[PDB]
Design a protein around this motif. Structure first.
Motif, PDB file in Angstrom:
ATOM      1  N   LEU A  28       0.833  -1.198   0.000  1.00  0.00           N
ATOM      2  CA  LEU A  28       0.000   0.000   0.000  1.00  0.00           C
ATOM      3  C   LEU A  28       0.866   1.244   0.000  1.00  0.00           C
ATOM      4  N   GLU A  29       2.021   1.158   0.652  1.00  0.00           N
ATOM      5  CA  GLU A  29       2.939   2.285   0.649  1.00  0.00           C
ATOM      6  C   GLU A  29       3.445   2.604  -0.768  1.00  0.00           C
ATOM      7  N   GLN A  30       3.817   1.590  -1.545  1.00  0.00           N
ATOM      8  CA  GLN A  30       4.258   1.874  -2.909  1.00  0.00           C
ATOM      9  C   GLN A  30       3.101   2.452  -3.733  1.00  0.00           C
ATOM     10  N   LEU A  31       1.891   1.931  -3.543  1.00  0.00           N
ATOM     11  CA  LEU A  31       0.750   2.476  -4.280  1.00  0.00           C
ATOM     12  C   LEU A  31       0.537   3.957  -3.950  1.00  0.00           C
ATOM     13  N   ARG A  32       0.786   4.365  -2.700  1.00  0.00           N
ATOM     14  CA  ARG A  32       0.639   5.776  -2.346  1.00  0.00           C
ATOM     15  C   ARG A  32       1.622   6.657  -3.116  1.00  0.00           C
ATOM     16  N   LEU A  34       2.219   6.386  -6.039  1.00  0.00           N
ATOM     17  CA  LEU A  34       1.557   6.587  -7.332  1.00  0.00           C
ATOM     18  C   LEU A  34       0.316   7.450  -7.186  1.00  0.00           C
ATOM     19  N   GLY A  35       0.009   7.857  -5.950  1.00  0.00           N
ATOM     20  CA  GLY A  35      -1.162   8.681  -5.693  1.00  0.00           C
ATOM     21  C   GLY A  35      -2.425   7.854  -5.457  1.00  0.00           C
ATOM     22  N   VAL A  36      -2.268   6.535  -5.428  1.00  0.00           N
ATOM     23  CA  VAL A  36      -3.388   5.613  -5.209  1.00  0.00           C
ATOM     24  C   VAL A  36      -3.607   5.419  -3.712  1.00  0.00           C
ATOM     25  N   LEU A  37      -4.809   5.750  -3.248  1.00  0.00           N
ATOM     26  CA  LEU A  37      -5.139   5.642  -1.829  1.00  0.00           C
ATOM     27  C   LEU A  37      -6.147   4.531  -1.597  1.00  0.00           C
ATOM     28  N   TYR A  38      -6.169   4.006  -0.376  1.00  0.00           N
ATOM     29  CA  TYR A  38      -7.005   2.847  -0.078  1.00  0.00           C
ATOM     30  C   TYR A  38      -7.561   2.925   1.337  1.00  0.00           C
ATOM     31  N   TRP A  39      -8.811   2.496   1.514  1.00  0.00           N
ATOM     32  CA  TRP A  39      -9.402   2.368   2.850  1.00  0.00           C
ATOM     33  C   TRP A  39     -10.128   1.039   2.930  1.00  0.00           C
ATOM     34  N   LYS A  40     -10.143   0.436   4.116  1.00  0.00           N
ATOM     35  CA  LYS A  40     -10.910  -0.787   4.334  1.00  0.00           C
ATOM     36  C   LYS A  40     -12.134  -0.486   5.188  1.00  0.00           C
ATOM     37  N   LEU A  41     -13.310  -0.900   4.714  1.00  0.00           N
ATOM     38  CA  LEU A  41     -14.578  -0.615   5.397  1.00  0.00           C
ATOM     39  C   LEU A  41     -15.437  -1.872   5.537  1.00  0.00           C
ATOM     40  N   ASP A  42     -16.424  -1.814   6.427  1.00  0.00           N
ATOM     41  CA  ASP A  42     -17.442  -2.860   6.553  1.00  0.00           C
ATOM     42  C   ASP A  42     -18.514  -2.659   5.489  1.00  0.00           C
ATOM     43  N   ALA A  43     -18.407  -3.385   4.382  1.00  0.00           N
ATOM     44  CA  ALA A  43     -19.304  -3.158   3.255  1.00  0.00           C
ATOM     45  C   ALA A  43     -20.755  -3.541   3.558  1.00  0.00           C
ATOM     46  N   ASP A  44     -20.994  -4.311   4.616  1.00  0.00           N
ATOM     47  CA  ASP A  44     -22.380  -4.566   5.008  1.00  0.00           C
ATOM     48  C   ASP A  44     -23.057  -3.278   5.485  1.00  0.00           C
TER      49      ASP A  44
END
Ligand SMILES: CSCCC(=O)C(=O)O
Ligand SMILES: [Co+2]
Length: 179
Positions: A28-32, A34-44
């Motif tokens: 995830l650090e390398q993706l950042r 590249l400007g790519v951000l990520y979050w993990k959520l409870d999709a329910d």
């Protein structure tokens, strides 16, 4: 945690994982960088989730809808998934929050090598304006996703080459500034 990797050199069967051998995982650090951000959520909880609200308010994701990519239910399905998978960029962020199912977002790294990002239920990603990317279903052939946008959306893909746009120029300038 979220799985991303450099791809092998096969051009066949784009819905397969295509993991490079030996494995070349991407963090995830390398993706950042590249400007790519990520979050993990409870999709329910997507209809009513304070944690999603926090992200939307922080990032000004004032607009959303839901899309279901299913061979049966999606209008103009075959042409749509072809357009998703052509390498392209946008003049705005591409923000997707996976509610059900799964898929791959591929993005170009700083040396224009493909990184495959596996997105599953609960995963939320934003691809920055100007990044060259594409999306494909995986072998399960199904995804349901929330689309978000900063303001009223404009979805227009500009298929590579699309190097003349200001959004691409500014994005290249951003890349100079990361590790
Ligand atoms: C996981 S969302 C489906 C893909 C999509 O909406 C896009 O590539 O623009
Ligand atoms: Co796109």
């Amino acid at each position: 945690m979220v799985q991303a990797w450099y791809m092998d050199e096969s051009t066949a069967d784009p819905r397969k994982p295509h993991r490079a051998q030996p494995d070349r995982p991407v963090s995830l650090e390398q993706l950042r960088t590249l400007g790519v951000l990520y979050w993990k959520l409870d999709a329910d909880k997507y209809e009513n989730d304070p944690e999603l609200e926090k992200i939307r308010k922080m990032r000004n994701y004032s607009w959303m809808d839901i899309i279901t990519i299913c061979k049966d239910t999606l209008p103009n399905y075959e042409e749509k998934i072809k357009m998703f998978f052509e390498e392209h960029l946008h003049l705005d962020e591409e923000i997707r929050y996976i509610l059900e199912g799964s898929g791959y977002f591929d993005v170009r790294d700083k040396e224009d090598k493909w990184i495959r990002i596996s997105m599953e239920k609960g995963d939320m990603i934003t691809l920055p304006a100007g990044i060259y990317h594409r999306f494909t279903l995986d072998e399960k052939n199904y995804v349901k996703a929330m689309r978000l946008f900063v303001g009223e959306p404009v979805w227009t893909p500009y298929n590579r080459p699309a190097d003349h746009f200001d959004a691409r120029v500014q994005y290249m300038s951003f890349l100079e500034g990361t590790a």
